């Protein structure tokens, strides 16, 4: 008939990929990096403590100048911080208080945010008047917004909990592309360092590599036992690290199509809310919900650091574009800026 | 510097408006409005006036924010910790669903489908100390329907008596036994009536009592 042999060819074509992943898996990244020395115990101290948010911080994003950073909280405020001098540049009141994501434009002119109202609002930071106003509100998603990320001042890609990603055009305000491959809620995005690709991980325990120009999923990466909560690209753009409710982080490779490392420990049993790399790709930072960030040696899979300054769930974390600092926002209403001491 | 000491005093005009708006927001009452769908969730917001639908109904010098989440067709476990610090949860259950079954795949009879969701919300880890203002909506619209068919189609281990004021007692106790956290929080139960004032006065009466027991626990008295 016809009801079964395409279901069995989807079984066949999923057998077509698995041993083709196995044939290209002759050794492990642990064995090839078995000769290198570890990075040592990475000690970082809280340089700055950014305070003024009055509820749980849900997202933060740095500017590209490595000094300004936007942070989102559910007291209804979007705050641009000066990270050097701990002082506020702007505080933006939002329409909906249910903001789950925030983004900084790579030019600095715009800040996006979205959440449970199913729209990504765009904010003009540099106006001829002295305020910050909403330029566009991008409606068209059916589920909550999980991640907004700018390509440039006119293009932004969003993620949503209606199992779809979308590429928008901020001038006209409508989706030029829709990215429909996921079956669960999509929880995070990460743009490549050339912005011709991106990766999104979802609650169906899979992450998908998408083409921005064509609109089609290139590769789909499995390997997790629960919802993927955080995606970050490696600085090469040829790898990406995930973070799940599985209490595990996995490093995938695009040109080898499969999972290389697995960043886990015996005592950790709680989820991973945030994933970021450092400027070298040598350290992997990961925010957990047993209230502390854990710096992972990305090549040796050893917990080579701990950032233990937060009283609640470490909710967001990012590293600057020059790798000089790392901020961690959290549910105890504080962003802490950490730096290694000479 | 001269221009960095004006950047500092702008930044503590940011700060004294963040502090001023965040203390006018800790005074208002936040309320989730959950339910099972068509279980009277619109006639309560009709008495108090595409993602969240926030509704504001300041009643007796008490600003009430009521967040309806019924249009979120996603996994509830991914966004429900946003409502973790919330004053109460207003739960609506239609009493006129004690006989009609769920039409999906001949499922449970649509009050167990509500009991799927009352147990999941009450015993949740984010709502381990959040009082629930439980509403039993269609009181008159099943009282004429309980005289035709008894209260045995859903709960077969009922005592009997086939009438209203034991079905109004057995069903109410059949929801308040799902509270497996009884020392931490309370379930308040109401029957939704045609009186336009008695249904918002119960939300004002029951949420004053959440504020008391929060102010007793924040001190040493609890």
């Amino acid at each position, epitope marked *: 008939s016809e009801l079964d042999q395409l279901r069995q060819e989807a079984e066949q074509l999923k057998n077509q990929i698995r041993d083709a992943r196995k044939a290209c898996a002759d050794a492990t990244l642990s064995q090839i990096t078995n000769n290198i020395d570890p990075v040592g115990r990475i000690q970082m101290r809280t340089r700055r403590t950014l305070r003024g948010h009055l509820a749980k911080i849900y997202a933060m994003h740095w500017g590209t100048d490595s000094r300004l950073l936007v942070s989102a909280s559910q007291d209804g405020k979007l705050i641009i911080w000066d990270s050097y001098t701990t002082n506020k540049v*702007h505080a933006i009141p939002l329409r909906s208080s249910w903001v789950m994501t925030c983004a900084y434009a790579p030019s600095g002119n715009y800040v996006a945010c979205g959440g449970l109202d199913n729209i990504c609002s765009i904010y003009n930071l540099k106006t001829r*008047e*002295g*305020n910050v106003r909403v330029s566009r509100e991008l409606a068209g998603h059916t589920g909550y917004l999980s991640c907004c990320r700018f390509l440039d001042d006119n293009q932004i890609v969003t993620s949503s909990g209606d199992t779809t990603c979308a590429l928008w055009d901020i001038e006209t305000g409508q989706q030029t592309t829709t990215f429909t491959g996921h079956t669960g809620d999509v929880m995070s995005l990460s743009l490549a360092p050339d912005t011709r690709l991106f990766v999104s991980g979802a609650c169906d325990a899979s992450a998908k590599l998408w083409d921005v120009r064509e609109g089609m999923c290139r590769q789909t990466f499995t390997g997790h036992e629960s919802d993927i909560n955080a995606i970050c690209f490696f600085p090469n753009g040829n790898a990406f690290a995930t973070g799940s409710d599985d209490a595990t982080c996995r490093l995938f490779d695009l040109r080898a199509d499969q999972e290389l490392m697995t960043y886990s420990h015996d005592n950790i049993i709680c989820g991973i809310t945030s994933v970021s790399f450092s400027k070298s790709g040598r350290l992997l930072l990961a925010g957990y919900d047993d209230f502390n960030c854990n710096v992972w040696d990305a090549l040796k899979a050893d917990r080579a650091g701990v950032l233990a300054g937060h009283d609640n769930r470490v909710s967001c974390l990012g590293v600057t574009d020059d790798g000089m600092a790392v901020a961690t926002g959290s549910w105890d209403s504080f962003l802490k800026i950490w730096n290694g001491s000479s | *510097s*001269a221009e*960095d000491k*004006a*950047a500092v005093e702008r930044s503590k005009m940011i700060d004294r408006n963040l502090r001023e708006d965040g203390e006018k927001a800790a005074r208002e009452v936040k309320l989730l409005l959950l339910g099972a769908g068509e279980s009277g969730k619109n006639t309560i917001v009709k008495q108090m006036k595409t993602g969240i639908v926030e509704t504001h109904f300041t009643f007796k010098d008490l600003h009430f924010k009521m967040f309806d989440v019924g249009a979120q067709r996603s996994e509830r476990k991914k966004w429900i910790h946003c409502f973790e610090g919330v004053t109460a949860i207003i739960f609506c259950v239609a009493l006129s669903d004690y006989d009609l079954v769920l039409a999906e795949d001949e499922e449970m009879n649509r009050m167990h489908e509500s009991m799927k969701l009352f147990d999941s919300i009450c015993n949740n880890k984010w709502f381990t100390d959040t009082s629930i203002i439980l509403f039993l909506n269609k009181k008159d619209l099943f009282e004429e329907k309980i005289k035709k068919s008894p209260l045995t189609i859903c709960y077969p281990e009922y005592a009997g008596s086939n009438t209203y004021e034991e079905a109004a007692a057995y069903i109410q106790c059949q929801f308040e036994d799902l509270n497996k956290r009884k020392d931490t929080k309370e379930i308040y139960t109401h029957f939704t009536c045609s009186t336009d004032t008695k249904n918002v006065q119960f939300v004002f009466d029951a949420v004053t009592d959440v504020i008391i027991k929060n102010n007793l626990k924040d001190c040493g008295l609890f």
Partner: single-chain antibody
């Protein structure tokens, strides 16, 4: 458009008193610090007063301190300057300048149209040793300005500003903090310098680049201008 238009004054006897009033329109007045900058007839600019956003910090010039007082009312978007004991060195055209200070902002960017006042009958010195340059279009000019104290600061930026008063007009900001071009300024203008000596470079002169080119510092109050450099055509 953003609009600052000031009124009040025009003729007053010496020893008298006049209240100036700048009425703002088209921007968020409460977020800007406001200055007054006056200009004596056939002379240069000099700074008068300042109030921060929120009116919690007031400065004055040492020439007018005690006599003048500056105030705002943000629900009415209006800037005031109450002047008592009006001397004969106070006859000037008074400008109303808006100014915002956060990280990366552009202060002194929009100037008012200027009201005139006619009265009948230590710090940083900014020197522009050139007062006038003959020039034709197509030329590249490099206007220099010198400061007594070093304008570079420890936080890393050099607080030198550049302005252009076209004839019959109000000054417009060209360069803020010695190197950053203002909004709406063509790319021909370019500022540079180091610490004590600075130069402003125009690449190709047009029919609109003619006026007086002032340099101002913002390192500490008082804000001292230079005597401007005229570019005649």
């Amino acid at each position: 458009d953003v609009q600052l238009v000031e009124s009040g004054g025009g003729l007053v006897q010496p020893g008298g008193s006049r209240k100036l009033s700048c009425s703002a329109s088209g921007f968020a007045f409460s977020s800007f610090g406001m200055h007054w900058v006056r200009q004596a007839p056939e002379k240069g600019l000099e700074w008068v007063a300042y109030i921060s956003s929120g009116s919690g910090t007031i400065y004055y010039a040492d020439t007018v301190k005690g006599r003048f007082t500056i105030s705002r009312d943000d629900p009415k978007n209006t800037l005031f300057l109450q002047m008592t004991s009006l001397r004969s060195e106070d006859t000037a055209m008074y400008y109303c300048v808006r100014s915002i200070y956060y990280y990366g902002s552009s202060p002194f960017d929009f100037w008012g149209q200027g009201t005139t006042l006619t009265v009948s009958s230590s710090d940083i010195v900014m020197t522009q040793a050139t007062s006038s340059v003959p020039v034709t279009p197509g030329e590249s000019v490099s206007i220099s300005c010198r400061s007594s104290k070093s304008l570079l600061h420890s936080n890393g930026n050099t607080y030198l500003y550049w302005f252009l008063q076209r004839p019959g007009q109000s000054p417009q900001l060209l360069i803020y903090r010695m190197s950053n071009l203002a909004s709406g300024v063509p790319d021909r203008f370019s500022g540079s310098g180091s610490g004590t000596a600075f130069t402003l470079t125009i690449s190709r002169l047009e029919a609109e680049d003619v006026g007086v080119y002032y340099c101002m510092q913002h390192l500490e109050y008082p804000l001292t201008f230079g005597a401007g450099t005229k570019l005649e055509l």
